[PDB]
Design a binder for these strands. Structure first.
Ligand SMILES: Nc1ncnc2c1ncn2[C@@H]1O[C@H](COP(=O)(O)OP(=O)(O)OP(O)(O)=S)[C@@H](O)[C@H]1O
Ligand SMILES: Nc1ncnc2c1ncn2[C@@H]1O[C@H](COP(=O)(O)OP(=O)(O)O)[C@@H](O)[C@H]1O
Ligand SMILES: [Mg+2]
Ligand SMILES: [Mg+2]
Ligand SMILES: [Zn+2]
Ligand SMILES: [Zn+2]
Ligand SMILES: [Zn+2]
Lengths: 438, 204, 162, 662
DNA sequence: GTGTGTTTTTTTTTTTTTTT
DNA sequence: CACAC
């Protein structure tokens, strides 16, 4: 197996060092630039690898869970070769993949596709906190004090401490983790929901758990529509049939459209070309009219309403005085009138166009479900807060249809947050004041 | 397709009818005619009656294995070439099963002394006597007053003993104690609370 | 760069001394724990001490002690546990979460567990803003014990407050 | 060399052991091959050859073989199947795979194996009447889906690797009922830990559904029983939660320590391995039909639909066949047909979405067969959900969240409108439920979506429902001299969604009374229970009684409706926007001036929706001029009949210039 | 001597839902 | 984890 591993590693190293379209070694340059900014990762495009050699792509697609670590090792070797003068302590790089394969529907994932490469889409609904998985693990033998090290691929096959002393018997479990010398990486658990337009008729949407890793952690937030290219993997949870196995995805690529966590991490992820295009658009004298005409084109008339929608989507400038109190920069707009005047269509369009937007129905709305819900943790028996609908719209807009159908006890709960942009919760021993600038 | 016909003897019209208050453990292994109001009934499940096992090697078939309240299996292979003391595969097709239900009865309303909580009991029904006593119907059961030990203490391949006088000291028990629970096993029950030609033929 | 928040406390800072600001929200009850037991042998008139170490007590990893008082000497002599001369330390476990106001849009505040010991117990109460300086240590087995071979649970991470 | 008669006289004591005989297995394989290739019905075509054709073409991997077909020809095979299905499932699946190879060479690439779904099992049971004699045998129990786990991959061929000495274990077949046991290792007799090999292992889909005794069949005042059914690969996700279905499968049993501990007896727990499924939710009045899918249409059925579609006057014949047992009321029949076929839901660039379902409200005096019309619609449409008056709350209509009793978290379950998605929802006594419940359906009937923002669960469901409602005029009688709004208790927005509103008046006319009473009495005499074997003779009698009243057979009309709904997407290219614009402008002009009926843009879209339904019912893929004029006439007549009689004559005089030609 | 088995929990507190 | 089965 070592000979085959070396063969594959050398082939991938040659692919990295040699691949180029026109006089520019794209992957070499990308790896160098990523190393320059201490970004130990590499985004490998699938068509490039396929065009380089179909055999490598076939071997990858057959058993990705075993091929990928060899590719990462080759990437690390290339990084050492072309970023450090020979004659270390460089972390193993994280591979990122981009593909154009047909996106398999979420409910179409079945008993087959196991341990394969799968591309699909969905909407994020839950993002757990970052846990830590060990990669370098310094370990100590309990009795004879034989210290060694272990390297963990983090790619579960379908690993535990060695069951022998390995140099008096020292017991079947003679090993203890040396925490102060081991190395760990961050891991995040996400929960995807299938696209509502792709659900079966009369069928509730299907959830699916997956795991990010390292540089892919904290890449998206719940409520965002993304596409994932990963591995359809299996793990056995001990929590009700016989020989049942929990399915999940190991992520190898994210393609979002609303940027990273926060609003592009509350800073500009804007490339120079699109930024310059925005500046050019800003200099248009008729920009106001163009924006007004670009709001709900299917909706005839309602020019003043469209202009007010433009103002809302832009919003004022938040002011924070030295004395402590703040001045909000959001606009609150209500649309009353006769039924059948495309007001709901206007709200749907606003939810569609706004980068952050949550559309809610008047009747299907509770005060505890709009801002925050106090829920008891099933495992730890502890209460915690889960963000409500309007909280998910933080920094954006909430389009509440059937506003006349607010429950009087539910409508009042938004009075503080739509003005103070803050939500005060004093429930189940929890006393917090979160921000909701919606 | 020979099918060994097992029989269920149904006794009825005993000289005496006891009640839950009249229950005495000294009548164990005897026939009574308990009458009580049915409140809760279990489902119709198949219970092993005559086990038919097969030893894992040399394939010797052990049949007609008597079953106690536990999951008892044969402990020795009749063929003196098979090392088998706890390893068997039950021949599900060959083994015999009985339709089984656990009904819950309680004291009749008229038999309740003032203030006293009406007293309950659990009865086992088998064969045609299954589903003939729906909840709410006061029925005059009859059968044998038996006692069920706690099979968790007896030791089971799938469960473990779980935690006011219990007896202990058995070879199969070891250190744990054994507790007992009175139950009834009925052989007969009676509740005490369409074409023209078909009607003519069913009419005296 | 070691001045961080519970949200920004990435795994790369493990075994590195960091300072984290936050709000005290939950405080476990003050619970003393043994670090050194003293025993008297009423057949030789000698005092034998046995020092107890834990992953949450000492920074350097050592073999955990079964927390059993040795009632007998090596030379078959009965030992009586000498309370008062044995050594116990006050221990507490509080939860520190970031500011709600620097919490990013669309996200709830995240929290970390801090282990105050000896003097630092009861020095804070829930609802207090605080800045703690201490070691970002990691604990647990993370499966890796044939109990969870493919299961993807991580490791216990916490801060030993200094 | 064994004959079918040689199959009949068993030699081995047990039937399963008899089947295990190799010569018997080969004989049964060849006989099933012949039965598949040569079974011919009355019309003469070999059903199963075309079934293999379709199985290959759609790669269904499942061969639905009727129990009645195997019982009628080579009966002892069906007797064995009803007695010992366990091995012949494998054998007949292999024979089906070989036949597919015959029709489709090298079909093993697409599907390594084939399954068979036995349909029309005679012995129907319930979760109360099951007995131990039914073990290891096929059943046809009926129940409502209560719980349903996710689609878990499950081990098919476990190939363990020994840890002490060996490295490979045999590909044991997982029973999916009890965990695979290895016992002493084959490589060495010593016992130790074991785990599967990730190199050569295959998985099959696994779902754990729980059927419960249906409320209809449970005796009143008694608790309903429940039993569990396992859906294997290609059978998972076939029945929604809360669905009433009929399952044909094997009634197996297995041992668990927990049950013995709880009951103190060596009792096993039963379990059902699914083999075929027919959803019976919404068609509880459609007995006597064959096949697991009543709305399923054959190729000849589609050919007949195409042939009768080209007929002129098909619209009128269809309209007359909506209520064959209900005399008169042709406009209501037309509106019901339009709502049944429905329009095409437009979605402009993914930004603007247009409802393509027609919602109809019937206001009328009691005893006008409005409830009977709704019952016919429920029995008729593909997906039908019936709710009545106060017997349906706000959350039960659309959706509701609940704390999971087992896992302790909030989960969302769909309501009446979710189960009626892309179907029809019928609301009896639409005037009689709570207004707060009545307002919970605005998003459902206009945006065709359900948005829930409660208990930390925020989502937007889709409910492409076609709302049909029945109400009662104020005081129980309709005062024609008053505006419609004064004769109702509802508001404009609830009135606005309904594309068509039909007003029914109970008058006393001797000719009308004569004809209606005669029709009702003729139907009742026809409906009397007392009014070449028994089956087809009964079918011939039913067809004789149906042809008196139904121009088109209802069992074929329902298939035609399903086919048109699922395969016709008419387009409005051939039309004149001038007439429609003028009609809408005049409608609004007369509504604002001496009128109470709200005429909004939704109402203008209703005309195109009804025209689309008209094109659908002719299987036309383009809305013809007749389909537009008929829709315009229907809309203007429904508007006029909603006005008071004082101005009704003048409104009809104004509108007469638009319904030209009819 | 190889391998086990515990200790081990469903309260009070939110949120929803139907009646009342 | 470790003492008791
Ligand atoms: N000015 C307009 N231009 C285009 N379409 C319109 C216009 N006014 C109304 N409509 C249409 O009329 C329908 C209105 O439906 P909705 O927007 O859901 O209801 P609404 O107008 O918000 O009023 P409600 O919700 O009943 S109070 C949609 O099909 C719109 O496309
Ligand atoms: N036009 C009609 N043709 C035939 N039967 C009718 C007609 N109108 C009413 N009926 C009969 O009246 C009975 C009761 O009607 P019902 O459904 O109560 O009307 P509504 O829903 O208006 O109260 C039904 O059994 C039906 O057969
Ligand atoms: Mg609207
Ligand atoms: Mg009626
Ligand atoms: Zn050692
Ligand atoms: Zn044997
Ligand atoms: Zn072995």
């Amino acid at each position: 197996n070592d000979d085959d591993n070396t063969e594959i590693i050398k082939s991938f190293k040659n692919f990295i060092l040699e691949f180029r379209l026109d006089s520019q070694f794209i992957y070499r340059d990308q790896l160098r630039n990523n190393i320059l900014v201490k970004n130990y990762s590499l985004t490998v495009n699938m068509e490039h690898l396929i065009g380089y050699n179909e055999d490598i792509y076939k071997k990858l697609s057959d058993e990705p869970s075993d091929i990928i670590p060899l590719f990462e090792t080759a990437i690390t070797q290339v990084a050492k070769r072309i970023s450090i003068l020979s004659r270390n302590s460089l972390p193993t790089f994280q591979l990122i993949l981009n593909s154009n394969a047909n996106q398999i529907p979420l409910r179409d994932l079945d008993s087959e596709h196991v341990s394969k490469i799968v591309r699909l889409s969905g909407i994020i609904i839950s993002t757990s906190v970052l846990s830590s998985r060990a990669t370098y693990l310094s370990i100590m033998c309990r009795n004879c004090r034989h210290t060694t090290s272990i390297t963990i691929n983090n790619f579960n096959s379908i690993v535990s401490l060695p069951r022998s002393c390995l140099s008096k018997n020292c017991g079947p479990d003679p090993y203890i983790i040396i925490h102060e010398s081991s190395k760990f990486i961050d891991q995040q658990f996400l929960k995807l929901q299938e696209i509502p337009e792709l659900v079966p008729v009369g069928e509730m949407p299907r959830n699916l758990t997956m795991t990010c890793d390292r540089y892919l952690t904290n890449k998206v937030i719940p409520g965002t529509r993304v596409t994932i290219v990963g591995i359809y993997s299996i793990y056995n949870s001990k929590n009700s049939g016989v020989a049942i196995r929990t399915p999940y995805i190991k992520i190898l690529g994210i393609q979002s459209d609303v940027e990273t966590s926060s609003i592009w991490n509350s800073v500009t992820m804007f490339t120079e070309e699109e930024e310059e295009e925005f500046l050019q658009l800003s200099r248009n004298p008729k920009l106001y009219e163009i924006l007004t005409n670009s709001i709900a084109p299917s909706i005839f008339g309602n020019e003043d309403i469209k202009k007010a929608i433009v103002c809302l989507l832009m919003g004022g400038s938040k002011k924070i005085l030295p004395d402590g109190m703040r001045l909000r920069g959001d606009i609150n707009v209500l649309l009353l009138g006769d039924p059948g005047t495309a007001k709901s269509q206007l709200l749907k369009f606003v939810e569609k166009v706004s980068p952050i937007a949550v559309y809610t129905s008047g009747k299907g709305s509770s005060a505890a479900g709009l801002t925050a819900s106090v829920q008891r943790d099933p495992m730890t028996r502890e209460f915690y807060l889960e963000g409500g609908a309007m909280v998910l719209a933080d920094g954006g807009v909430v389009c509440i249809d059937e506003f006349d159908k607010m429950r009087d006890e539910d409508r009042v709960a938004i009075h503080e947050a739509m003005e103070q942009q803050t939500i005060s919760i004093a429930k189940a021993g929890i006393t917090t004041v979160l921000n909701s600038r919606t | 397709e020979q099918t060994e016909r097992v029989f269920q003897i149904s006794f009825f019209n005993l000289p005496t009818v006891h009640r839950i208050r009249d229950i005495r453990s000294e009548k164990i292994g005897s026939l009574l005619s308990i009458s009580g109001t049915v409140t809760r009934t279990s489902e119709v499940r198949p219970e092993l009656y005559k086990a038919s096992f097969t030893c894992d090697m040399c394939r010797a078939i052990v049949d007609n294995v008597e079953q106690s309240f536990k999951y008892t299996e044969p402990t020795f292979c009749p063929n003196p070439s098979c090392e088998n003391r706890a390893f068997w595969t039950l021949n599900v097709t060959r083994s015999r099963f009985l339709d089984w239900q656990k009904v819950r009865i309680q004291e009749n309303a008229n038999e309740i002394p003032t203030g006293s909580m009406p007293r309950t009991l659990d009865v086992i029904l088998r064969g045609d006597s299954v589903e003939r006593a729906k909840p709410g119907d006061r029925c005059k059961f009859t059968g044998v007053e038996i006692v069920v030990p706690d099979v968790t203490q007896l030791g089971l391949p799938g469960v473990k003993p779980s935690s006011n006088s219990g007896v202990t000291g058995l070879r199969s028990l070891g250190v744990r104690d054994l507790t007992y629970k009175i139950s009834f096993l009925a052989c007969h029950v009676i509740s005490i609370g369409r074409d023209q030609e078909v009607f003519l033929n069913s009419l005296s | 760069a070691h001045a961080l928040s519970p949200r920004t406390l990435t795994a790369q800072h493990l075994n590195k001394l960091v300072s984290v600001e936050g709000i005290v929200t939950k405080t476990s009850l003050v619970r003393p724990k043994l670090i050194r037991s003293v025993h008297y042998a009423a057949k030789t008139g000698r005092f034998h001490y046995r020092d107890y170490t834990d992953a949450t007590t000492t920074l350097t990893t050592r073999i955990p002690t079964p927390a059993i008082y040795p009632t007998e000497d090596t030379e078959g002599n009965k030992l009586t546990t000498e309370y008062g001369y044995s050594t116990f330390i006050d221990h507490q476990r509080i939860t520190v979460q970031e500011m709600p106001e620097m919490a990013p849009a669309g996200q709830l505040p995240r929290s970390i567990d801090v282990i105050l010991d000896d003097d630092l117990v009861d020095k804070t109460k829930p609802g207090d803003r605080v800045n703690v300086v201490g070691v970002f240590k990691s604990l647990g087995a993370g499966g890796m014990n044939q109990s969870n071979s493919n299961t993807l649970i991580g490791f216990k991470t916490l801060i030993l407050g200094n | 060399e064994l004959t079918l008669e040689s199959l009949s006289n068993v030699k081995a004591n047990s039937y399963s052991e008899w089947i295990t005989q190799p010569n018997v297995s080969r004989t049964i394989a060849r006989e099933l091959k012949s039965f598949l290739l040569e079974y011919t019905d009355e019309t003469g075509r070999s059903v199963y050859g075309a079934r293999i054709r379709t199985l290959g073409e759609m790669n269904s991997e499942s061969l639905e073989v009727n129990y009645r077909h195997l019982a009628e020809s080579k009966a002892i095979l069906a007797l064995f199947l009803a007695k010992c299905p366990e091995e012949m499932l494998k054998i007949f699946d292999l024979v089906a795979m070989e036949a597919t190879e015959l029709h489709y060479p090298d079909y093993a690439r697409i599907h390594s194996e084939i399954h068979v779904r036995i349909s029309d099992f005679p012995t129907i049971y319930s979760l109360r009447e099951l007995r131990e004699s039914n073990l290891s045998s096929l059943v046809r129990v009926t129940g409502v889906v209560t719980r349903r786990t996710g689609v878990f991959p499950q081990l098919k061929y476990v190939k363990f690797n020994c840890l002490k000495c060996g490295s490979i274990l045999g590909p044991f077949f997982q029973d999916s009922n009890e965990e695979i046991r290895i016992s002493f290792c084959t490589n060495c007799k010593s016992k130790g830990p074991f785990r599967v090999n990730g190199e050569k292992t295959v998985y099959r889909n696994y779902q754990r559904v729980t059927l419960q005794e249906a409320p209809g069949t449970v005796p009143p005042g008694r608790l309903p029983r429940h039993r569990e059914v396992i859906l294997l690969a290609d059978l998972v996700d076939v029945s929604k939660p809360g669905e009433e279905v009929e399952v044909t499968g094997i009634y197996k049993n297995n041992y668990d320590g927990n049950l013995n501990a709880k009951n103190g007896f060596p009792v096993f727990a039963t379990i059902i391995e699914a083999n075929s499924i027919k959803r019976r939710e919404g068609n509880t009045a459609n007995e006597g039909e064959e096949g697991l899918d009543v709305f399923s249409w054959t190729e000849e059925e589609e050919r007949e639909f195409r042939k009768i579609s080209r007929d002129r006057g098909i619209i009128d014949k269809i309209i007359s066949s909506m209520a064959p047992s209900i005399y008169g009321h042709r406009d209501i029949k037309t509106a019901v047909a339009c709502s049944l076929f429905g329009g095409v839901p437009k979605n402009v660039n993914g930004k603007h979405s247009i409802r393509g379902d027609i919602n109809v409200l019937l206001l009328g005096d009691p005893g006008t067969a409005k409830s009977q019309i709704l019952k016919y619609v429920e029995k008729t449409a593909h997906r039908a959900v019936f709710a009545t008056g106060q017997g349906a709350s706000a959350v039960g209509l659309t959706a509701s969240v609940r704390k999971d009793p087992i896992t302790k978290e909030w989960t969302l379950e769909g309501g009446a409108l979710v189960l009626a998605d892309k179907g029809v929802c019928l609301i009896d006594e639409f005037d009689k439920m709570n207004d707060q419940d009545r307002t919970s359906i605005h998003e459902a009937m206009e945006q065709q979506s359900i948005s829930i923002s409660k208990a930390g669960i925020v989502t937007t469901l889709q409910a492409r429902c076609s709302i049909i409602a029945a109400a009662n005029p104020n005081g129980g009688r309709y005062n024609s001299t008053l505006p419609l709004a004064q004769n109702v208790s509802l508001t404009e927005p609830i009135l606005s969604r309904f594309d068509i509103l039909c007003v029914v008046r109970d008058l006393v006319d001797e000719e009308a009374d004569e004809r209606l009473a005669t029709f009702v009495v003729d139907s009742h005499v026809r409906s009397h229970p007392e009014n070449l074997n028994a089956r087809q003779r009964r079918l011939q009698r039913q067809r004789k009684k149906e042809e008196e009243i139904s121009p088109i057979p209802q069992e074929l009309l329902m298939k035609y409706i399903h086919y048109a709904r699922t395969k016709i997407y008419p387009k409005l290219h051939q039309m004149d926007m001038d007439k429609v614009s003028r009609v809408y402008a005049d409608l609004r002009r007369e509504s604002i001036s001496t009128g109470s009926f709200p005429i909004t843009v939704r109402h203008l879209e209703s005309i195109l929706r009804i025209a689309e339904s008209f094109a659908k019912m002719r299987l036309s893929e383009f809305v013809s001029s007749y389909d537009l004029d008929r829709a315009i006439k229907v809309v203007v007549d429904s508007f006029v009949d909603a006005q008071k009689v004082s101005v009704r004559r003048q409104l009809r005089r104004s509108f007469a210039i638009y319904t030209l030609g009819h």
